Enzyme design. Structure first.
Site, short mmCIF file in Angstrom:
data_model
loop_
_atom_site.label_atom_id
_atom_site.label_comp_id
_atom_site.label_asym_id
_atom_site.label_seq_id
_atom_site.Cartn_x
_atom_site.Cartn_y
_atom_site.Cartn_z
N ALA A 1 0.91 -1.13 -0.06
CA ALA A 1 0.05 -0.08 0.14
C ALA A 1 0.86 1.43 0.06
CB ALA A 1 -1.02 0.06 0.99
N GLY A 2 1.71 1.46 0.85
CA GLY A 2 2.80 2.39 0.96
C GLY A 2 3.60 2.53 -0.17
N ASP A 3 4.00 1.52 -0.78
CA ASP A 3 4.86 1.34 -2.15
C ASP A 3 4.10 2.26 -3.29
OD1 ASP A 3 6.96 0.49 -0.68
OD2 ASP A 3 6.44 -1.50 -1.09
N1 LIG Z 1 7.12 -6.42 7.76
C1 LIG Z 1 7.25 -6.57 6.58
N2 LIG Z 1 6.07 -7.29 5.70
C2 LIG Z 1 5.83 -7.47 4.49
N3 LIG Z 1 6.78 -7.08 3.63
C3 LIG Z 1 8.07 -6.37 4.26
C4 LIG Z 1 8.13 -6.09 5.64
N4 LIG Z 1 9.28 -5.66 5.62
C5 LIG Z 1 10.02 -5.58 4.48
N5 LIG Z 1 9.10 -5.93 3.53
C6 LIG Z 1 9.61 -5.96 2.26
O1 LIG Z 1 8.78 -4.72 1.78
C7 LIG Z 1 7.91 -4.95 0.80
C8 LIG Z 1 6.35 -4.81 1.32
O2 LIG Z 1 6.27 -3.80 0.89
P1 LIG Z 1 6.32 -2.42 1.78
O3 LIG Z 1 7.58 -1.71 1.23
O4 LIG Z 1 6.19 -2.77 3.12
O5 LIG Z 1 4.93 -1.83 1.12
P2 LIG Z 1 4.26 -0.63 1.69
O6 LIG Z 1 4.97 0.67 1.12
O7 LIG Z 1 2.79 -0.86 1.70
O8 LIG Z 1 4.51 -0.48 3.20
C9 LIG Z 1 7.53 -6.60 0.49
O9 LIG Z 1 7.50 -6.60 -0.78
C10 LIG Z 1 9.08 -6.93 1.29
O10 LIG Z 1 9.92 -7.39 0.32
N1 LIG Z 2 -7.37 0.12 4.73
C1 LIG Z 2 -7.29 1.06 3.65
N2 LIG Z 2 -8.42 1.37 2.84
C2 LIG Z 2 -8.01 2.09 1.84
N3 LIG Z 2 -6.74 2.63 1.55
C3 LIG Z 2 -5.67 2.45 2.30
C4 LIG Z 2 -5.99 1.53 3.57
N4 LIG Z 2 -4.89 1.26 4.20
C5 LIG Z 2 -3.79 2.15 3.48
N5 LIG Z 2 -4.39 2.73 2.34
C6 LIG Z 2 -3.73 3.61 1.53
O1 LIG Z 2 -2.23 3.24 1.56
C7 LIG Z 2 -1.56 4.40 1.72
C8 LIG Z 2 -0.41 3.95 2.51
O2 LIG Z 2 -0.40 4.57 3.92
P1 LIG Z 2 -0.27 3.50 5.04
O3 LIG Z 2 -1.35 2.78 4.78
O4 LIG Z 2 -0.29 4.39 6.27
O5 LIG Z 2 1.31 2.89 4.71
P2 LIG Z 2 1.43 1.33 5.16
O6 LIG Z 2 0.29 0.61 5.12
O7 LIG Z 2 2.34 0.90 3.78
O8 LIG Z 2 2.40 1.47 6.33
C9 LIG Z 2 -2.47 5.32 2.62
O9 LIG Z 2 -2.25 6.69 2.46
C10 LIG Z 2 -3.81 5.23 1.76
O10 LIG Z 2 -3.76 5.67 0.59
#
Ligand SMILES: Nc1ncnc2c1ncn2[C@@H]1O[C@H](COP(=O)(O)OP(=O)(O)O)[C@@H](O)[C@H]1O
Ligand SMILES: Nc1ncnc2c1ncn2[C@@H]1O[C@H](COP(=O)(O)OP(=O)(O)O)[C@@H](O)[C@H]1O
Ligand SMILES: Nc1ncnc2c1ncn2[C@@H]1O[C@H](COP(=O)(O)OP(=O)(O)O)[C@@H](O)[C@H]1O
Ligand SMILES: OC[C@H]1O[C@H](O)[C@H](O)[C@@H]1O
Ligand code: NA
Ligand code: NA
Lengths: 306, 306
Positions: B250-252
């Site tokens: 989601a964050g990516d």
């Molecule tokens: N605790 C974790 N859970 C899942 N993936 C992780 C975690 N820590 C690092 N990763 C790596 O980060 C990527 C998960 O994407 P992440 O960068 O966590 O996405 P987001 O931007 O939604 O946080 C995965 O593809 C994995 O290779």
């Molecule tokens: N439950 C959800 N429903 C809809 N959008 C979501 C949800 N969770 C995360 N997002 C989207 O993913 C983006 C990544 O933010 P966040 O979820 O805080 O980071 P991460 O989950 O990678 O730690 C949010 O700003 C929002 O756009």
């Protein structure tokens, strides 16, 4: 016709070394990712082969490069791979493994091609099971295949040796067809409900297995050796003591070496000491099939530590 | 010269579903094993490419099949892979992700080839960083390479976007070089020592980052949207309401889509909302790059939600 037939799993072990084991909340950082030939089936076959058993392997691998390659590798260890099937459109089984500095390990598997070793699938291998003197199996392939094999072995003077790993419950129809069972402490408890913590509880668990119709019971106790029970009569046979690098495949090495010892006419207690030596050496080494010693190494060990 | 340069990690995500949290000892039966391309760097570069950014990627992968293959795959995604290095005798970064039925997951990550992405390693990539409009980075590669890249970009007037994930403390030296930072709540706390309870404390956290020299702060708030603070002016921008099944990428997805929107001259608030849509699609899908939507999918979602 091979004197020993092993039927069981083949896995690619995806292994990381870890400082500690993960807690539900934090991300653990590992190192030294390796892909290592494993699977309890293959580990026990390779252990028996390296102990110089006349061994044939019945198993399923995938049609991935790993599966093709490892089936060829088994031949180099002198395993007859006639009964190792290549499964189209299926990966080879896998294990994800973390090994800590203490040698402890956590293992999670996915069946993949191992799921294809059904009763029907082993129809062409029933002859080999019959002509063998010993059949060694574990619980990483489908139960229906394991049962059919044990049933076939009993109509043909084949000793049935079951390593009930990983832990699960088992039907009476199977247990009554097992001549020798080798649970660990966890597996003994799953099978009997009797936790094993001392001599009397070991003997309870064993008796419960004796009632299920299994003549010889060997409960493996890690570094504490094993508990050997022969219809009511129990005793601890200690292992050898070593610094652990990785206990992955210690049990597999013990099983493959034990059956080999028995096949080669070593009395039961001697075959256990032999198996302890092979397993202890393997404890000092990393990875599944990569830790399994050669017969020469086991002999040298025994020469040193009588 | 690519208008967007992403610098960051590449991982093979090895995903398994298991019944319980993995513990040392007995082997656990898992299921549904997959290797999904992952890593924050690759996920963000793939997100940007799918959103049709003019993107180059700087990263280290292994000389395993996965690394060799993924570099070719990145090319097909529309990513300039000139800055993607294959490291000899080294596997690609891996994340072992074990998804338990009981709720909490076990994650073990090994840097492998990612650790080779040092300040020296990116010397031939400095020209591309200077020539870009935006540099997007995360924290899943060594800090020295991240710092070298941020400094190079600063003197070149390249905008630096830092997604400070996974969480760690950062030096004033790096933060001074960041134009826009996108922490989640946990990361905002690690960076500032300020726990984010509500709007007032979100602004507290944001102004702590402003005081480190960062013009724009976006604190992502899970399902609560985003806290945007521009030079001290804070506001909450809500996301979309969806059935979230997997937030892994989601964050990516959010970061890749955000910068692409900015490159398309969308006003910042609008780019954030556009990125909310992309991220929202991703949280309804399983896995890293497997969840990342295309620009066409994001447009259909926005049309349907209008
Ligand atoms: N605790 C974790 N859970 C899942 N993936 C992780 C975690 N820590 C690092 N990763 C790596 O980060 C990527 C998960 O994407 P992440 O960068 O966590 O996405 P987001 O931007 O939604 O946080 C995965 O593809 C994995 O290779
Ligand atoms: N439950 C959800 N429903 C809809 N959008 C979501 C949800 N969770 C995360 N997002 C989207 O993913 C983006 C990544 O933010 P966040 O979820 O805080 O980071 P991460 O989950 O990678 O730690 C949010 O700003 C929002 O756009
Ligand atoms: N630390 C050790 N030192 C020496 N031998 C060991 C050690 N751990 C295991 N072994 C040998 O390996 C065999 C299997 O032991 P164990 O680790 O209990 O298997 P499991 O993990 O399946 O319970 C033992 O009977 C013993 O021969
Ligand atoms: O007993 C060790 C084995 O169990 C699991 O099946 C792994 O493949 C590993 O090799
Ligand atoms: Na070992
Ligand atoms: Na998702």
């Amino acid at each position: 016709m091979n004197k020993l037939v092993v039927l069981g799993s083949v896995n690619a072990d995806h292994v990381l070394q870890v400082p500690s084991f993960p807690r539900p909340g934090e991300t653990l950082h590992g190192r030294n990712y390796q892909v290592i030939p494993g699977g309890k089936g293959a580990n026990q076959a390779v252990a028996a082969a390296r102990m110089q058993a006349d061994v044939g392997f019945i198993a399923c691998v995938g049609d991935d490069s790993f599966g093709i390659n490892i089936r060829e590798s088994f031949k180099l260890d002198g395993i007859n791979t006639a009964g190792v099937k290549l499964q189209p459109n299926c990966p080879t089984g896998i294990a994800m493994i973390q090994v800590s500095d203490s040698g402890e390990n956590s293992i999670c598997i996915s069946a993949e091609a191992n799921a294809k070793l059904t009763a029907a699938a082993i129809e062409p291998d029933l002859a080999a099971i019959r002509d063998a003197r010993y059949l060694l199996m574990q619980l990483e392939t489908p139960l229906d295949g394991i049962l059919k094999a044990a049933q076939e072995a009993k109509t043909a003077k084949t000793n049935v040796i079951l390593n009930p790993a990983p832990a699960r419950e088992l039907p009476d129809e199977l247990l009554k067809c097992v001549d020798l069972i080798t649970p660990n402490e966890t597996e003994a408890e799953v099978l009997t409900g009797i936790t094993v913590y001392d001599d009397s509880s070991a003997q309870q668990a064993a008796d419960a297995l004796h009632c299920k119709g299994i003549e010889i019971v060997i409960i493996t106790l890690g570094s504490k050796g094993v508990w050997l029970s022969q219809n009511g009569r129990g005793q601890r046979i200690p292992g050898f003591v070593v610094k652990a690098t990785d206990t992955t495949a210690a049990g597999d090495t013990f099983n493959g070496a034990l059956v080999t010892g028995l096949l080669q006419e070593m009395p039961l207690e001697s075959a256990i000491k032999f198996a302890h030596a092979a397993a202890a050496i393997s404890v000092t080494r990393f990875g599944a099939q990569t830790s399994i010693p050669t017969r020469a190494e086991v002999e040298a060990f025994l020469a040193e530590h009588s």
